Amino acid sequence: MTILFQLALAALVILSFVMVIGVPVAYASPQDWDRSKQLIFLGSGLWIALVLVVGVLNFFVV
Amino acid sequence: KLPEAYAIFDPLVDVLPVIPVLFLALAFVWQAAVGFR
Amino acid sequence: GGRIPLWIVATVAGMGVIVIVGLFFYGAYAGLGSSL
């Protein structure tokens, strides 16, 4: 649990950092918009789920 | 203090509140990229 | 004479000035002149 929490949170952190860069770059890129639109939607979903997971696991490490 | 399980993310937390200032500075990098047109 | 774009040269030189100035503020709190 404590290790599981910490990777999950580290993963949120890392995903966040890739969203921060990726979403503006994608949105303002001329060509690659097909592959981009899907991932943005995918990353977004992963990001939301990861917030819930850290939220729930909080109660097991705290 | 942060709950112990979060201590690891402590130094990250120390630097976040500065991020808004970085947005103001970013506008100037961006405008320089486009020659202040 | 055009290779490295002026916006990068400015963002980089500007970050150097912040770092060196940030360092000077840190030193206000540590070592000589810190009142400790």
């Binding site: 950092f17 921060v20 860069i21 503006p24 770059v25 303002a28 890129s29 001329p30 | 130094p11 990250l12 120390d14 630097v15 976040l16 500065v18 991020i19 970085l22 947005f23 500075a25 970013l26 990098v29 961006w30 990229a33 486009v34 | 774009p5 916006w7 990068i8 963002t11 970050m15």
Partner: peptide, 29 residues
């Protein structure tokens, strides 16, 4: 402290990086 400086280095670079990534790609800046 090394952790703090690294964190602020990665966050610090995220901004210009984006601009650069768009400039290299001739993006909609």
């Amino acid at each position: 402290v090394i952790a703090q400086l690294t964190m602020i280095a990665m966050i610090g670079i995220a901004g210009p990086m984006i601009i650069f990534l768009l400039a290299v790609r001739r993006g909609n800046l």
